[PDB]
Symmetry: C3
Subunit: 132 residues, 3 copies
């Protein structure tokens, strides 16, 4: 019965570093547990969730982390070969309680080549696997 | 109780563009909601589904889209560095109703380097997350 | 009611080939269905499971397979462009019965550039989609 899911896309490239990436294009976010203006997902239903993210790389390297309450729980890295775009993904099962927050963020200003556009979709998704 | 899931693999490289990619190798498709001869997934049970795809890149760039009823809902892109294969993935939560169709397709003839073989598996998967 | 999920990370790079990759860093493994010392996941609850893996490539090419009871069911490949790291992912729906085993393994010694570290996470995840 309990349901929570979302898939958001970034319409513009090179988000600011050291802060939640504000994916603004909504593909699905019916329960509104993800906030487009903050780029943060807030848990309302306790349980284990599955998160997945896909980023495109261009201009420079990309180092991105999946954060939980301000702490990085997973890092994904990919290097840019001059003149060629690349794509990198990551995913993880995370146990969440009410008010817990999850988001994506670029920790370092040097590896910030996160690319996205109307035709190249870097995205972020998540959904409740089992209520607990 | 309601169940719907599938994982299919492409046995040959470079599928035709502008049409559903016919993944022919079945890993799982018990409910038969995915059609190997059309490469189209048809919803029989309303609800939110999670789709995931993984493609290998070789020969030229790859631009692939996840389509819903003839309209692209997500694009994944990756460029081919001469002499080196690459791998790109994408995924999304999609709300579906009975008779809705979902598939993967290469929109452009110029970015059609979708590679696959008996030992390098480009795949397509999907499963019901929550009945509605 | 039935629940089974896990997400593990490899703390060191270049695991031994021809044997299960022993992901040692636990992100989630409450049901303990995955064994860190063997790198093998053993099914205790029959049903269809979804597995996902993400590897980073460095030094040489990477050819990795998702195995079920000693047989490869899916292969992912990615080539290393000298001086540039790459990232490759794969996923699949697998029907499992009690005592069935699933794991990741590098079949060939020539394509063993599987990289991982404290800041670059190659991971392996899986969870029960539907009990059967
Ligand atoms: C012709 C139409 C606009 C009207 C435009 C809109 C989006 C464009 C594509 C994407 O940008 C991805 C990729 C970027 C590469 O650089 C070159 C190849 C490719 C497939 C582009 C091709 C072509 O240019 C497109 C389809
Ligand atoms: C020796 C046996 C056939 C008997 C053949 C069957 C499939 C072959 C592999 C895959 O093709 C992927 C990859 C392609 C690269 O190009 C070179 C490396 C690698 C790992 C290949 C190596 C070797 O050649 C294989 C194992
Ligand atoms: C300054 C701190 C240690 C104190 C160290 C700890 C982990 C390091 C990063 C990762 O290694 C990934 C990546 C490898 C590239 O090679 C260079 C860029 C980047 C983002 C590294 C940058 C920097 O060096 C880091 C943050
Ligand atoms: Ca590339
Ligand atoms: Ca590559
Ligand atoms: Ca790269
Ligand atoms: Ca590359
Ligand atoms: Na990649």
């Amino acid at each position: 019965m309990p349901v929570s899911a979302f898939t958001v896309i970034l319409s513009k490239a090179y988000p600011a570093i050291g802060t939640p990436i504000p994916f603004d294009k909504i593909l699905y976010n019916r329960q509104q547990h993800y906030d487009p203006r903050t780029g943060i997902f807030t848990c309302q239903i306790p349980g284990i969730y599955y998160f997945s993210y896909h980023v495109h790389v261009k201009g420079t390297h990309v180092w991105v982390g999946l954060y939980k309450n301000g702490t990085p729980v997973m890092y994904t890295y990919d290097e840019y070969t001059k003149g060629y775009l690349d794509q990198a993904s990551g995913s993880a099962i995370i146990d969440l309680t009410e008010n817990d927050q999850v988001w994506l963020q670029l920790p370092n200003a040097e590896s910030n080549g996160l690319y996205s556009s109307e035709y190249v979709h870097s995205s972020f998704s998540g959904f409740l696997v089992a209520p607990m």
